[model samples]
Target: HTLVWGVWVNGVDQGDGRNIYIRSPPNNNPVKNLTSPDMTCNVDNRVVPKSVPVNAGDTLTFEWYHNTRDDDIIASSHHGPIAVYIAPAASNGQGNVWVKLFEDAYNVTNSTWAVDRLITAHGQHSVVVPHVAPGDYLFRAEIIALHEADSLYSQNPIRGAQFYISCAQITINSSDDSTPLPAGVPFPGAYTDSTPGIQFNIYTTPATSYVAPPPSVWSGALGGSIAQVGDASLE
Candidate 1:
């Protein structure tokens, strides 16, 4: 299993394990049940008083690793999409107002996945902070590993997509005071045990294209546009 160990905004490292809601011992395990309350952040993650500060449209990097930053990132078999969502931090990450901030799945030409890109960058997944009204928010960074999803969760409780998640608490410093964000879907309710992407078979299937779970990217303070964090090279 892989876990996001460090978070960097712009080029500044926000101290290890500071604002992210990380799981306890046996900490890096991935969550498999889409409907489980643990899907929100992970098992036993608590609210931290300290929050990372960022400006609207800033690039934030979520760094993942197996045990430590120096360890291998994750098994290469764990390939799939990567995404980020944001919600009012006051909601405690359980509310229904979460909105998509960024997402990258398969790249057909390169035959690479977001996870592959993550590995190429040595575990860093960079995301652009959406332009939203200033306030506190929970940034949920996630990766859905489909290595074992060939079997449905209903067939066997253990065989399904693996979800590695990290929720970072942040205070956004933005002057754009317009409507904060667009409406969004709930976490547990947003996905299912057999959603196409959630229960797919990468090894046996012939389809090369994939559709990431829905509630597509929302237009933000940019006025009907979404800005994807384009660069992944180490800083």
Candidate 2:
């Protein structure tokens, strides 16, 4: 089976219409909420289902969306890169711990295909990896904290913090054989974090074209006006 996923920023789709977000639990939203003295920033991880079956020669595509809303207070100061990871499957039914499979830290924002490298990155872009093997895999998207630099103005700094929200399982089997599987569906609504910080709206679908809206902007001193910023995308 072939799979495609996407990420959104502040209620906008960023990819080329090939990804969707799950709106409900089981398909839990992959957004996070972080509170700070300056303002509120919503971070989205954007992942797929747990068990996706595919063949050894199948292709897997993943895309990234950045919150570009000028109204978004966080986006006004800080910009980060999208990082990708893959983990091995567990022996038992319990989900196994994940490991880093790939990282798009190079900032390949406009690149369409991500191959021959462990990671890729660009200025607000997407990537596609072909010919994936049969196995249980964990996929995650995160913002590069090291690149934050002095952009973070919150009283309490979240410099090293990273958020991963989307994930899906891949299984390669002989029962179902097809050139490419139908586009997967997306969950609606934003994913909130168990911790406190930001709130993000996540979308997952089969579409390949999408554009992420900018983060909301706020006007006030540190810890003054209380405004909320959100994100949206298709994966």
* TM-score of candidate 2 to 2 decimals: 0.35
**Residue 34 local lDDT, model 1:** 77
Question: What TM-score would each prediction reach against the true structure?
Answer: 0.88, 0.35
User: lDDT value for candidate 2?
Assistant: 0.28
- Give the range of the ten consecutive residues with the poorest summed lDDT in model 1: 221-230
Best by lDDT: 1
Q: Which runs in model 1 stand beyond 4 Å of their true positions?
A: 18-26, 221-235
- Model 1, 40-90: lDDT tens digits are 877866777677788877777777778667456888889888888888877
Model 2 weakest 10-residue run by lDDT: 217-226
Q: What is the clash count of model 2?
A: 79
Compose the digit string of candidate 2's lDDT tens values, residues 1-235.
0112343232234333332332112322222223321111122223434354444433343333233321121221222333333334342211322233333322245432221121222122322222334455444433422222222223334432333334434444542222222222111111122222222111232113322212111111011101111222212
Model 1 scores a C-alpha lDDT of 0.73
